[PDB]
Amino acid sequence: KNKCVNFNFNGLTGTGVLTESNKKFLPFQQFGRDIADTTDAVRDPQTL
Amino acid sequence: KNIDGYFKIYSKHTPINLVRDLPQGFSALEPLVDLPIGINITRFQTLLALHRSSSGWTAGAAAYYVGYLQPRTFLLKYNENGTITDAVDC
Amino acid sequence: VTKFNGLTVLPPLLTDEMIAQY
Amino acid sequence: QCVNLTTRTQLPPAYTNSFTRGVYYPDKVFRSSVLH
The reply to whether residue D19 touches residue B87, judged by beta carbons under 8 angstroms, is no
D33 touches chain A (CB under 8 A): no
User: What CA–CA distances, in Å, run from B53 to B45, B59, D5?
Assistant: 26, 12, 15
Contact D30 A29 (CB under 8 A): yes
Q: What is the DSSP string of B4-70?
A: TTEEEEEE-------SSSPPS---EEEEEEEEE--------------B----S-B--S---------
From the list A25, A35, A10, A45, the residue with the least C-alpha distance to D25 is A25
Nearby residues of A44 by Cβ (< 8 Å), 6 or more positions away: none
Q: Nearest to residue A28, comparing CAs of A15, A13, A10, A7?
A: A10
- Closest Cα in chain B to A35: B78
Give resolution in angstroms: 5.9
Q: Give the residue among D1, D12, D27, C20 at the shortest CA–CA distance from B78.
A: D27
Q: For C21, list phi and psi in degrees, rounded to 5.
A: -75, -35
Beta carbons of A43 and A34 less than 8 angstroms apart: no
Cα B50 versus chain centre, distance = 22
**CA A16 – CA A14 distance, rounded (Å):** 7
B89, B3, B65, B69: which is closest to B38 by C-alpha?
B3
For residue A34, list chain C residues with Cβ-Cβ distance below 8 A: 3
Ramachandran area for residue A37 (φ above 0: left; ψ -120 to 50: alpha; else beta): left
A touches B (3+ CB pairs < 8 Å)? yes
Q: Which residues does chain D have within 8 Å of residue A27's beta carbon, measured at their own beta carbons? A: none
* Number of CB atoms found within 10 A of residue B49's CB: 8
Which residues, 6+ apart, have CB-to-CB distance to A6 below 8 Å?
A: A14, A15
**CB < 8 Å to B58, chain D:** 7
Residue A10 makes CB contacts below 8 A (sequence gap 6+) with: A30, A31, A42
Burial pattern D9-35, b for ≥16 Cβ within 10 A else e, equals eeeeeeeeeeeebebebeebbbbeeee
Experimental method: cryo-EM
